Symmetry: D2
Subunit: 134 residues, 4 copies
C-alpha cells in the first residue's frame, strides 16, 4: 500500500499530477523514492490538483477498473498526459528502473472521496485514485 | 515488499512455479491473496522448484533486468510458461483483478542466493527472484 | 494484519490461546507474520465463542480508541498470558525474547459486523483487543 | 523505516533530539511515517556528531542483537526523553498518547559503514539504537 506519511489524495498528486514531467525514467524517480520496488505503470496527468478536484464534482459514474464502485468521475475534456511503462520489471530495487514514454491526450477517470484529516481543509472532496484514462 | 511470513525462495515458488496453472484470473488469486493490491504482471514457470534450484548451479551471468548484479542463471532449455498481465491496473483492491493470458515457451533467468534460515536445509542455494524470460 | 486474514481471524491468532506455551515460544507464530518483534501481546485463555458472547455485553467507549463506541468489557476476569518483549532493540524476528507475565484480568474488545470472508454463523465478531484491566 | 531514508537518517529522526517537546507532541513526527503508534521511543538529547564519536568507542556485542558485534556504548550517561505509549490498543495514529519519562542513561548504538546516500564526510554512522542502560 501507499506510504503512510501521505493521505490518499497527497499520494495521488505525487503519482498522477505533473504539468511538465521530464522523461519517464527521470519522472518516476520521484515516486519510486518512496517505494521498495519500482511501479510497473504510471500515468502523469498534465494538469493541476485543483482541476482534478473540480472533476470530482462531475456526475458520479461506475469506475471502469472497479466495477462495484460508483464514486468515479470523468473529465469533460481530454488532457495531455505522459504514460510510463516499466521496461525491466525484474528490477529488485529502485536504483535501476527504466521506463518507456507514452505521451498522449485522453479523458481521465478518477475516484473521489471525502478528505483525510491530514488533507487541506480547502478541498473537502478529493481524488484518491486514478481509475483509468479513455 | 514480500509477505514477511515467506522467505524470498518461498515467495518465488508461490509466484513463479506452477506446473498446470488455471486461467490467469484464477491462478493469480493465490498470489494476490497475500497482497493489498493486484500484481501487475506475473510469469508462471511450468516446472518444479527442484528444477529451478538446479539452474542456480549454472554459470553465473549478469542479470538482464538488474545489470549491476551477476548472480543470475539461465536455463539451458526453454520451458513452458504462462504469463499473466493485469487488464485493470486501476483496481483498488484484490477482489476484482482480471488478467490476460499469454502462454509461451522460453528460457528463464533467475537470481539465486544462499537460503534463509527458514528455508529447507535441502537446498543451500535457492532462486530468490525471476529476473526475465528470453 | 496480513491481508489474507479478516480482522476476527487475526484477533484469534494474536489473542485467543487456551493453553499457550512460554511466551518466547508462543510469540513465534505471531512474529512470523511480521518484520519486527511485537513489543507486547496478551493471550486470552478463552474460546472464540466466549469472546463472541462478550460482544453481546453493554457497548462502551473504547478506552484506547476514544472516538469508537463499539467496545465490550468482559463481566469477569479471565486467565491470560501477557508477553513483554525483553529485547526491543532487536532488528529482526530471528531471536525475539519475551518475559512471561501470567495473570487474570478483565478484557475489553472491539466488536464489529463480520467480514464477508468470515463464517456466516457469527454475525458480530471481535476485531481488536482494546485493553485489559 | 521509510525507504527514502538511510538507516542513519532514520536513526536521527527517531533518536536524536536536543530539546524535545512533551512526548505526545514529539512522537507525532515519527508516527506520521507509520500506520500504527510506536510503542516506545527514546530521544537522546545529543548531537549527531556526539553519537558518531561514540561509534569510535570499543565495539561490543549488541545486547538486543546478540549475533552482532558492531555496537558501541556511550562512556557517560546522556540526558534523554523516553516515551511510552499509554494507549497501545490504538487502531491508528490519530491519537497516540504518550507518557513522558525523562532520564539520563548510557546508550548503546549499532554503527555501520555509511549508506551511499549518506554524507561522505562520516564514514561510519549510527544505524540503530540497541538499548539504554
Ligand atoms: Fe509491486
Ligand atoms: Fe503495486
Ligand atoms: Fe506495531
Amino acid at each position: 500500500m501507499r506510504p503512510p506519511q501521505f493521505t490518499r489524495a497527497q499520494w495521488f498528486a505525487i503519482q498522477h499530477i505533473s504539468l511538465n514531467p521530464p522523461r519517464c525514467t527521470i519522472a518516476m524517480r520521484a515516486i519510486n523514492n518512496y517505494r521498495w520496488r519500482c511501479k510497473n505503470q504510471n500515468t502523469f496527468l498534465r494538469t493541476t490538483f485543483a482541476n482534478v478536484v473540480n472533476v470530482c464534482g462531475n456526475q458520479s459514474i461506475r469506475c471502469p477498473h472497479n466495477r462495484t464502485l460508483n464514486n468515479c468521475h470523468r473529465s469533460r475534456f481530454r488532457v495531455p498526459l505522459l504514460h510510463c511503462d516499466l521496461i525491466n520489471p525484474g528490477a529488485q530495487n529502485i536504483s535501476n528502473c527504466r521506463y518507456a514514454d507514452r505521451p498522449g491526450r485522453r479523458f481521465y477517470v478518477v475516484a473521489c472521496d471525502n478528505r483525510d484529516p491530514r488533507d487541506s481543509p480547502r478541498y473537502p472532496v478529493v481524488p484518491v485514485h486514478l481509475d483509468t484514462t479513455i
